[PDB]
Paper text:
SNARE (soluble N-ethylmaleimide-sensitive factor (NSF) attachment protein receptor) proteins drive membrane fusion at different cell compartments as their core domains zipper into a parallel four-helix bundle. After fusion, these bundles are disassembled by the AAA+ (ATPase associated with diverse cellular activities) protein Sec18/NSF and its adaptor Sec17/α-SNAP to make them available for subsequent rounds of membrane fusion. The disassembly requires multiple ATP hydrolysis events in the presence of Mg2+; as few as six ATP hydrolysis events are sufficient. The side-loading and side-release mechanism explains how Sec18/NSF can disassemble SNAREs with constrained topologies.
To address this topological challenge, we next determined structures of the y20S complex after initiating Sec18 hydrolysis by adding Mg2+ (referred to as the ‘hydrolyzing condition’). Informed by a fluorescent protein disassembly assay, we initiated the disassembly reaction and waited 7 s before sample vitrification. The D1 ring is also flat in all these substrate-free classes, with all D1 protomers bound to ADP. In the D2 ring, all protomers are still ATP bound, consistent with their role in oligomerization. Class 2 has a well-resolved hexameric configuration with a coordinated split in class 2 in the D1 and D2 rings. This split spans ~20 Å between protomers and is large enough to accommodate a polypeptide chain entering or leaving the rings. The coordinated split in the D1 and D2 domain rings allows the processed SNARE substrate to be released from the side. This side-release mechanism, thus, addresses one part of the topological challenge stated above; threading occurs but the substrate exits from the side, avoiding the membrane domains and linkages in SNARE proteins.
Residue numbers in the entry:
A (entry chain E), B (entry chain D): 239 to 357, 368 to 479, 488 to 758
The structure:
Amino acid sequence: LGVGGLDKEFTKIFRRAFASRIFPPSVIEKLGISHVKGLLLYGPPGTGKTLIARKIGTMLNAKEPKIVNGPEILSKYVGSSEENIRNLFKDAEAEYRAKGEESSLHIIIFDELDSVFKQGDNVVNQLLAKMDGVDQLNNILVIGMTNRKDLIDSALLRPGRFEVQVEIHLPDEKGRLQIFDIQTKKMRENNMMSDDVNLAELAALTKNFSGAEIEGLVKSASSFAINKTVNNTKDIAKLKVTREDFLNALNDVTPAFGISEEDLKTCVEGGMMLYSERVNSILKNGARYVRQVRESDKSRLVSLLIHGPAGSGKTALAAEIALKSGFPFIRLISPNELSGMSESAKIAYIDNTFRDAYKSPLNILVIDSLETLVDWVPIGPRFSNNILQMLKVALKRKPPQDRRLLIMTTTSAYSVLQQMDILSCFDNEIAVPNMTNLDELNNVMIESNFLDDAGRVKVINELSRSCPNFNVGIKKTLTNIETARHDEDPVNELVELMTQSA
Amino acid sequence: LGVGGLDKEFTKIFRRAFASRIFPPSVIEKLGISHVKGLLLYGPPGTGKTLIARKIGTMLNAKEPKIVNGPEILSKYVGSSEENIRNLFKDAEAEYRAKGEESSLHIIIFDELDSVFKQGDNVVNQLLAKMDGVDQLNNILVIGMTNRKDLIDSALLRPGRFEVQVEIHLPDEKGRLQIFDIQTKKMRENNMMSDDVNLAELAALTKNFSGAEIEGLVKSASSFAINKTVNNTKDIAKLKVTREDFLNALNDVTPAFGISEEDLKTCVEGGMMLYSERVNSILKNGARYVRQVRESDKSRLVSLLIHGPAGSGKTALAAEIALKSGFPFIRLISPNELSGMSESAKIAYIDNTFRDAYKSPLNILVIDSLETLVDWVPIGPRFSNNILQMLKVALKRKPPQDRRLLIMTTTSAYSVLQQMDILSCFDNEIAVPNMTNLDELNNVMIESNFLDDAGRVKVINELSRSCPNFNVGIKKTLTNIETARHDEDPVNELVELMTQSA
Ligand SMILES: Nc1ncnc2c1ncn2[C@@H]1O[C@H](COP(=O)(O)OP(=O)(O)OP(=O)(O)O)[C@@H](O)[C@H]1O
Ligand SMILES: Nc1ncnc2c1ncn2[C@@H]1O[C@H](COP(=O)(O)OP(=O)(O)OP(=O)(O)O)[C@@H](O)[C@H]1O
Ligand SMILES: Nc1ncnc2c1ncn2[C@@H]1O[C@H](COP(=O)(O)OP(=O)(O)O)[C@@H](O)[C@H]1O
Ligand SMILES: Nc1ncnc2c1ncn2[C@@H]1O[C@H](COP(=O)(O)OP(=O)(O)O)[C@@H](O)[C@H]1O
Ligand SMILES: [Mg+2]
Ligand SMILES: [Mg+2]
């Protein structure tokens, strides 16, 4: 037919809404049943809802559907907006006067149905009165479509109105291998496709692409072969695309529900040097929870707290554990995203982020500096109570239907979180200490190629009686080393910075 | 073609948006790909985004591009505003009905697209309908332009809408040489340009000029040579522009993204004298960080705190370090800039200043009198929490894309910042102490010729017995020395003032 990967939920639509339309009225009169008049489809954008609503009508040989946009009718002035509602059905009315129950099936698509409620009452009255009032047309069938099911009021969902509802899902790996077979077909039968490409590879790499994004990949890959030979010449009738084109294109289309990789990675890491055994222990703990979530049925939600002094290195460890996990979906929430929003906008940004994490089979979330998102200042104290009560719920709600996620949160002010008592949310606590031994500083000096070994010995010797007991974080230690590299005499400056920091 | 310095952007634009229009229709119908309908260009103003749109379309010999300006739609009356969106496409429809699919390309430029969202839903919806709806045209391509990309709703950026996005940067030194080649062409071939000029020099002095400001320079340098002949004369054919005429024009034109020279030099500095050995060490240690930021790869953000008593000389040291750096971009934020603004306007002025600093290769910021920007007063205490949380984030965010900057900030209220808990933001702290020795008072008098030295002994001989332990700042000392000079008995006046001031 033309739609891939929906073979299950395709069946249910036909069974309830259309199979009754195939039989002639005389056997329907024998049963005394009455045709359903509304259907509601919901799911994430770009998944092919309209494609279903169009392709089904071809099997009935029905009229090509009318299509309407909510925001248009709502943003039009009330006058033509009002009169446009009544103008719609005249065709479905007209053939009913001419032919009645022999009349051909009519269909109307009403897009963005939630836009009416997210603030059309006349439209809702008129739209119902034509299908459920006394002026009941039997010709019509209205398809509603929305991204959010929770905004539509139950007054529309009682029987006779929108009585059947279906959910559309992102395609799994068996499905993307079908969607490639649909999109590429014309390139294959004309032999414009090389034979080194193999679609069983491309279905595995496109780990989370939706249906609409796979076209962008095919179209983008094809655009290299054209540009390779332009600049009105021969070989126009001899063009081929190559597996090289199908691997360059993966850099020009970036998926939604993907990995934010210019965050983390190049931004959050300036090193990772295993100066002490305690670092190896923490990275082994972090990697164990990542596999427990992958390989267990019994725990779909885990959340961890990472805490310690300021500048001790918490955020780089939370990112390093994530990039090695390989999960399809990763995002973070940090103060850099929320700057300049009003409080009423901040709560909507947090809420929308969690609504996305319930749509992929595996997920990670990172929350950076929880004490800063709440606006804590100790002089009052002053803080936002509305934002605190949002997070306190979101950390306990479990995702639906065997989806699962791992949450990691970091803080510098454990004494304050204990005073708000929210510590009943977390399943475990990981503590990060500062540096405290001169042997650890020797490892840092070696690993960063400070200077030749004759110099490093004197620096350790000098501190060994000037300040044997110092206590300083790794973030500051790597700064003092880097400024002394540029002075006249590093050995006599680095000691003076470290004793000031001690 | 006549556009310079934008090599890499040109390939990326041509490959995706236009190459598909060059091949014959029969081969595109063979592949089955579909033409891209929208392209988004963003960057700083005056950098040739509109220029590119005209000069690309001439290679296709397409029709002259229509132009419409966002505020010219929005500020009209709604009725004629609404009608104009329907009017704009009338030509593209009419040719399509006459030619069908073989119609020539049409192109439309939509300027200040970010004006529509910062409040347009009708005009947004109608614009989408012509490119994404049932009535979608194949003849059009729509070019969008913005400066503040983050104001675009991501609903515009999904496949099929504004699918491709490109950033235009300020030119580097390899590029500014090409712009002078283009702009001077007519002057050189008519021989109206002297042989004493050297375009490879002027490209180096125009250290941060944008393309639109080099037109202003070349025009202004020509106006001197014209005016030199008027008050209109015979022998006009003798004209030449000369190297000196560019050196005079380079004072009449001043760029954005340049030094705020007169607000640093004339206001903040009023004599710098090396009265004591502590002052040599602060300037030496301050000049080290300026070459760390210039030369090191691994550190791209640095922030310093300068703190100490009132009137000690803190603001004059911050400006003296800046004016010797030679960095291209320098600015300061001080209470004089924000006086009389509303709290909702103060936050907007601070935010916009940091987003300019992220566009140049090297930058400095001075943030003066930190406890005054917050309005802190101890009787309540009262202060603004919304401004404090604006600064606490902005001091930690690293600049994008291998750019770098140095931040310096000054305070008198170290005992208060220790309560607001913001001292984790700063990498090093510099202390500026008061005067305490009569050798320091002697050095200040010698530098400023208070009076002949046979008198100058007596001031110290009396203070040495009247009150040796005087403790005063340099700001008050220079004020006392200047008011005694105009008296009848300078010796007693200065001794009295310093004894009282202590
Ligand atoms: N083994 C390590 N553990 C932690 N950090 C390391 C290690 N090796 C190098 N680093 C570096 O130390 C710095 C730690 O910075 P980071 O921002 O994570 O500190 P932080 O404690 O989170 O700061 P804040 O408390 O202000 O959030 C980074 O530049 C990181 O590359
Ligand atoms: N070595 C020096 N260091 C600092 N200032 C000096 C020095 N020599 C002369 N001056 C002069 O002393 C004055 C110091 O004034 P300035 O406004 O910098 O004080 P301040 O510490 O900023 O005062 P406030 O604490 O109110 O900001 C300036 O006019 C400056 O030119
Ligand atoms: N499962 C699928 N199989 C084939 N094509 C698909 C599929 N999903 C999306 N598409 C393609 O993307 C478009 C259909 O999705 P569309 O209806 O535009 O998204 P939405 O449902 O958000 O309106 C068509 O161009 C269609 O060919
Ligand atoms: N890269 C460039 N090469 C040559 N001239 C340029 C360039 N960029 C800008 N100019 C000059 O600046 C003038 C105005 O630029 P404009 O296209 O209006 O910039 P924008 O549209 O981004 O404001 C142009 O007419 C042109 O002569
Ligand atoms: Mg942190
Ligand atoms: Mg000052």
